[PDB]
C-alpha cells in the first residue's frame, strides 16, 4: 500500500489544505502554506487528528510507517510548493522549511524504558525529565558539492571534489536527555533516561528538569537510504524529538469522606509506620510533602522551599525515611554527602560521542526543579558542595561563570 | 598391536583412525541401543616445556597445567641409599652437608645451613580437617651484592633438579606465579605460569624479588603464604599449587621495608653435588617425619622463654619446620630437642637478624601536627617541599610512604584532601 | 483441548512440559526427535496451525510463537562447563550462574542473519559460567553466554544461579551460545534429614556451644567469635521488610588481628567451610562487587557482591580497599544492592551478601589505644554499619600461650565438617519465628544492656540480637525462639562488651 500510493497523498495533501475554510478561505494547514512560501513560518507541525476524522489512512498508516508517511508527507510538500509558491533536489527544496507532527492520544508520551524493537520506525512521543543540554551547532545535511568542470549546483548527502556550503542544506541541532519523571518508577529500578536526537527550532528552547512533550520521530528526509528498511550498515534510531513542549501543568470529602478529618492528626497515624513516633517531625515532612510550591500572586517565591535539616544519622535509622520520603516524594531525589561531586546536585560539562558538544547535565538539584531535595550526610558536602547549596538558598541558583557556559539553571 | 606400533609412531594419524572406527564398529557390533549419547565415549574411551603446543581442545581442553608428571597421552606432529644411609648414620655429616655444598668464597655456616635445611625443608601436611600446611621455610636474601649470589642461586639451581632461576622485574609474561593472557584466537587460555610454576615443589631463585611486578604482588602474598594461588578471573575455579620453595633474592631495599607489605618479610627467614640430588631426594621422597614431643615440651617451654622474650607464633611455626629439616637430614621418625635447640641456634641468629638490635607513634603525631595543626589544605606544606621538612624530620620517602602516603590509608581527611589539593597546587 | 490456553494477546511464548509434549503428532507441536531446527519451527508452525484455529488474529509471522520447553528435562541437563558438542544444536537444561553479563540493545533488522521488512529485535546475550557452588576445588571452564530474546530480555538479572533450558546455539571453529529458551530461577526454585532430626535433638546435646568448636578446630580462645563465626555462618536470606527496610540479619562482621592470630585461617576455615561463600582479601582487583561495564566487548563482570548474593564473604585486609570500595560498600551494605550507573550499566543489583571482615592493627601490632574508628582508620560509620567488630587482641596470656603451642601440637599429629554443611542447609530455610516471651526477654534486657553499657542502638542492635537469637534457634532447627536462644545473644553482645 505504501510505496505506490504517491498520487493519493499528493492528491490528499493537494486537498487537505483545501479541506476547510479554517485558514481564512483555506484550511489551517494551508494557512501556513502561504506563510511558508512567503517565509513567514518555516517549520511545520501536524495535528494528525484532523486527518483521521475523514481518513485514518496516513494516521494509522503513518503510525505503522512513520518514516514513509514522514518521507511521503515531504515529497508531496516538495512538489506542492509551486501551487502556493509566490515566485535531485532543486536548491530551495524545503531547505530551511520543516515539518513536525502531533495529534491524538494514539501516540501517548511513552516511557524511556519502553522504547523497543517495535519502536523502530515508530511514531513516537514521550514525556519525562530533561537534561544533557548540549552546545548547539548548525549542522549541514546535504553536501551541495561541485562538479567544477560542469558548473551549476550538485548535491550529495555525502575526491579532488570540494564540498561547499553555498547551496547545502543545514540545520541547528542539539543533544538532549529526557529522563523518567521520578513518578512512574515506584520501583527497585533506575529512573531511566535517554540519549535524545534534537533538532530544528526545537533547539535553543528549554532547560533540563522540565516535564515536557516530545515526538521522537524520524525525519522525512530519508526512508532508509536508496531502498527500503532492510540495509547492511545503519546507525541508531535514537529519539528524534519533534514537538518538544513543556508541561507547565498537566477523593473529596464532599463525594467521599476523606479530607474532613485532620490529616495533621490523621496523616501522621497513616504515615511513617515503622517510625517510632516522633510524628512531630513528620509534620514538617508532611508540610514538605505538601510543600508550598503553587503560590498565590503575593510574590512569595520562597514559599516553595521547606528547607529542613535533621541532625545525627542512625537516629532511628532516619537514614531510612528519606527513601520513605522519596517513596512518598515524586519530583524527588536522594543524595549523600561524599557520594559524588556537586554534580550529584549541580551540573558539569564534557564531550560526548553520539551527538551534541559538551552536554551540561546536572544533579539532583538540577534534577529537582521545585522538587524534594534529600540528603545524606550534609556535612560531607565539603566546601564545594556547601556552596551552590548556599546559593540554592536563593532558588534558581545553579549559576555558571565558566569560559563557554555562564548560565543559571532553575534549582 | 603388532600391526600398529611402529606405524603409529611415525604414522599415528590414520592407523589409530582405524581403531576408534573399529571401536565404533565394535561398539555398534556390541549392539547396545545406539542413540547419539556420545558423551560417555570419553568414559568408554578408557574401556609445554616438559615449549610445545599439544592437543588442548574438545576432550582435551583445560585438563591440567604443564610440566606435570608427564604422562604423554598422545603424539604431536639403593646401593646409593646405603651410602646415603651411612651419611644418615654419619654424625658430622651436617657440616660437610653445610660445607661440601659450600664454595667457601664467602658465607657464614648458619647462612648456608639454612640452605642445608632448605633443601630438606619442612613437610607437606595433609592435616586433620580439609586445610593442609606448608613443610618448607623460606629465606629472604638481602644485603649488598658482590657475592656471586647468582652463582649461589645457580649453585642451588644447578643443584636443584626441581627449580629454575627466575628474574628480575619479570620477563615475557610468565609470573613468579600463574600469570595468564589471551590467545588471539578466542583467548581460551594462556597458561603463562610463573617461577614457582616450573619449580613447584622445587625452589625459586627470585632475583630482585622487590623489583617484581605489582601484578603478581597482590597475588603472590597469599600463595607465598599458601603455596597456592587462585586464578581470580570470571569463573575459573582453578587455584594453582605454588608449592615451590623460596630463594627470594633482592637487595636490601632503601618487616618495615616492603614496597607495600611490611609483614610479608614474615613469609621467609632472615638472610642478610649431584651426590646431593641422589641424597636429598629420597628423604625428600620419604621421611614423613614428625617432632619429638619432649622437644615440643622444651619448645612450649622455650617459647614461654621466648614469650618472656605473630613473630613468635610464626617463629613457632618456622622452628617447627627447621628442626623438621633435620629429621630429614637424619631420616628420623621425629626430631629431638637438639634439632630444635640447634634450630634455635639457627633461628636465634635469624632472630638476632630479625632483631637489627621506637614506634610510629612519633610519626602520626608530628604529621597530624603538620597535616592540620600546621595546615589542613597543606598549601606551602607540599611534597614538593615538605619532603625537605621530612628530610628535616628524618621521615624518608619509604617512611612517608610508610606513613604519609598511607595516612591516606587511614582515611585521613585533610591529608587525602591534600593528596588532591596539592595533587597540582603544592 | 490442549492448545487453546495460549494467550497471544499476551506474549506468544509458552511454557511446555515433556509429559504433554509427547502426546502430539508431527505438525501438532510435539518433540520426539529432539531435532530442534525442524522440531521447533514445526512446533511453532504447528502452533501457527493451532492459533489460526484459535485466532487468526494470533496468526502473525512477526509473532514467532516461541517456547521455552521447560519441564522434566535431564538427558540434557548440565552446566556450561559440561555443555559440549554432543549437545551441538540440542536443548540443554542449563544450570549455571548468571554472572558475567552483557551489554544491551535491540538488534538491527535481522534480514540476512509492519514497521518495515526487518525491524530490530530486543536482544542481548547473557553469560553463564557453570554453577560454581558445586564446582571443582579447581578447574577452568569452557563456558558460554546465552541469548535473551525479546520477551526474555531483562527477565532475570546478574548473579543469579538459575534453571534455564534451551538450544545449544552453536555456530559451525566450534563457537556457540545458547538461546535460553526460558529461564526459571533455580535461584528461586529449590537423606540425613531424619538423621539430622535425630542428631538435632535438644536431648542430643547443645550443638551450639559444641559446633562453634567443632568447626574451630585449631583455635585457642575466640570461643565467642566461633559462635559469631557460626552465627554469621548462620542466618536467613529474607526479612519481611514491607514497604521499606531497616538493619537486617544478613549483617556482616569485622575482626582485628594477624593470620596466625587465626585471621586468614578463620577465614580459611570460613572459606574451607564456605558454602554459599566466596571470599576476598582487601582490594580484590577484579571488579570487587561490580559489573564494571566492560569495554569493547560490553560485559558486566559482576563482582563478588553480585557473586555473593544470598551469601557471605570473607574480607581480609579490609583496610586495603579503595576509598570507593571503602565507600560503595558502605551503603550497599545498607541497601544490599549495588548502585551502579555509568554510561551504560545503570542498576542497583542486589547485594544479598553478608561478610566477615578482617584487617590489620594499622601501624600497630597491638593497636589497643583508640577507637577503630581511627585505630584501624577505615574510620567512620562502616564500623557502626557492621555487624560486629571483635578484636583478637595480641594480649600475652602465658597460661594460654603455654597451652597454645600444645594446642598447636595436638593438631600437629605427633602421630564433623560436612555434618555442619548438612546441618546448615536444613537450618537455612527455617524461620524461628517470634515469641512474646522471648520477645519479652529480649525487650526486657535490651534496655538493660543499653543501660548497662551506658556506664548501642535501638533501631539496630535489637535487630542483630534478633538475628543472634535466630542463629541459636536456627542451629537448633527450632521453629520458634527459646528464651535461652534469646539469652546467649545478650551474652554474645555482652561478650562484645565483655
From Swiss-Prot, chain A:
Would the keyword Cytoplasm be found if you checked this record's keyword annotation?
no
Top-rank taxon of the source lineage equals: Eukaryota
Localization per record: Nucleus; Chromosome
Q: Which reaction does it catalyse?
A: ATP + H2O = ADP + phosphate + H(+)
What residues does the Glycyl lysine isopeptide (Lys-Gly) (interchain with G-Cter in SUMO2) crosslink join? 11, 24
Q: What is known about its processing and modification?
A: O-glycosylated (O-GlcNAcylated), in a cell cycle-dependent manner. Ubiquitinated by ECS(LRR1) E3 ubiquitin-protein ligase complex when forks converge following formation of DNA interstrand cross-links. During mitosis, ubiquitinated by TRAIP when forks converge following formation of DNA interstrand cross-links. Short ubiquitin chains on MCM7 promote recruitment of DNA glycosylase NEIL3. If the interstrand cross-link cannot be cleaved by NEIL3, the ubiquitin chains continue to grow on MCM7, promoting the unloading of the CMG helicase complex by the VCP/p97 ATPase.
What keywords sit in the KW lines? Acetylation, ATP-binding, Cell cycle, Chromosome, DNA replication, DNA-binding, Glycoprotein, Helicase, Hydrolase, Isopeptide bond, Nucleotide-binding, Nucleus, Phosphoprotein, Ubl conjugation
* Gene Ontology biological-process entries: cell population proliferation; cellular response to epidermal growth factor stimulus; cellular response to xenobiotic stimulus; DNA damage response; DNA replication; DNA replication initiation; DNA strand elongation involved in DNA replication; double-strand break repair via break-induced replication
MF term (GO), any? single-stranded DNA binding
Q: What else does the entry mention about this protein?
A: Early fractionation of eukaryotic MCM proteins yielded a variety of dimeric, trimeric and tetrameric complexes with unclear biological significance. Specifically a MCM467 subcomplex is shown to have in vitro helicase activity which is inhibited by the MCM2 subunit. The MCM2-7 hexamer is the proposed physiological active complex.
The name on file for this protein is DNA replication licensing factor MCM7
Q: What organism does the UniProt record list as the source?
A: Homo sapiens
Q: Which gene encodes it?
A: MCM7
Curated annotation (Swiss-Prot), chain B:
The disease tied to this protein in UniProt is: Meier-Gorlin syndrome 8: A form of Meier-Gorlin syndrome, a syndrome characterized by bilateral microtia, aplasia/hypoplasia of the patellae, and severe intrauterine and postnatal growth retardation with short stature and poor weight gain. Additional clinical findings include anomalies of cranial sutures, microcephaly, apparently low-set and simple ears, microstomia, full lips, highly arched or cleft palate, micrognathia, genitourinary tract anomalies, and various skeletal anomalies.
Please give the residue positions where the record annotates the modification N6-acetyllysine. Answer: 154, 158, 388
What is the superkingdom listed in this entry's lineage?
A: Eukaryota
Positions of ADP binding = 133
Known catalytic reactions = ATP + H2O = ADP + phosphate + H(+)
Compartments (UniProt record): Nucleus; Chromosome
In Swiss-Prot or TrEMBL terms, this protein is called: DNA replication licensing factor MCM5
Top enzyme class of this protein?
Answer: hydrolase
EC number, as in UniProt: 3.6.4.12
Listed PROSITE patterns: MCM_1, MCM_2
One Pfam family for this entry, by name? MCM
Gene encoding this chain? MCM5
From Swiss-Prot, chain C:
Question: Residues where N6-acetyllysine occurs?
Answer: 205
Q: Where is the short sequence motif Arginine finger located?
A: 384-387
Show the catalytic activity.
Answer: ATP + H2O = ADP + phosphate + H(+)
Q: Name one GO cellular component term.
A: alpha DNA polymerase:primase complex
Q: Where does ADP bind?
A: 265, 300-302, 304
Known EC number: 3.6.4.12
Print the keywords alphabetically.
Answer: Acetylation, ATP-binding, Cell cycle, Chromosome, DNA replication, DNA-binding, Glycoprotein, Helicase, Hydrolase, Nucleotide-binding, Nucleus, Phosphoprotein
> In the UniProt record, does the keyword Isomerase occur?
no
GO MF entries: ATP binding; ATP hydrolysis activity; DNA binding; helicase activity; single-stranded DNA binding
Modified how: Acetylated by MCM3AP.
**Signal sequence region:** none
Start and end residues of each MCM domain: 207-409
Q: Where in the cell is it found?
A: Nucleus; Chromosome
Q: One GO biological process from the UniProt record?
A: DNA replication initiation
Judged by the first EC level, this protein's enzyme class is hydrolase
Subunit relationships? Component of the MCM2-7 complex. The complex forms a toroidal hexameric ring with the proposed subunit order MCM2-MCM6-MCM4-MCM7-MCM3-MCM5. Component of the CMG helicase complex, a hexameric ring of related MCM2-7 subunits stabilized by CDC45 and the tetrameric GINS complex. Associated with the replication-specific DNA polymerase alpha. Interacts with MCMBP. Interacts with ANKRD17. Interacts with MCM3AP isoform MCM3AP; this interaction leads to MCM3 acetylation.
Q: What else is known?
A: Early fractionation of eukaryotic MCM proteins yielded a variety of dimeric, trimeric and tetrameric complexes with unclear biological significance. The MCM2-7 hexamer is the proposed physiological active complex.
**Which protein family is it in?**
Belongs to the MCM family.
Functional summary from the UniProt entry? Acts as a component of the MCM2-7 complex (MCM complex) which is the replicative helicase essential for 'once per cell cycle' DNA replication initiation and elongation in eukaryotic cells. Core component of CDC45-MCM-GINS (CMG) helicase, the molecular machine that unwinds template DNA during replication, and around which the replisome is built.
Name the UniProt record assigns to this protein? DNA replication licensing factor MCM3
The beginning of the lineage is: Eukaryota, Metazoa, Chordata, Craniata, Vertebrata
- Positions spanned in the full protein: 34 to 654 of 808
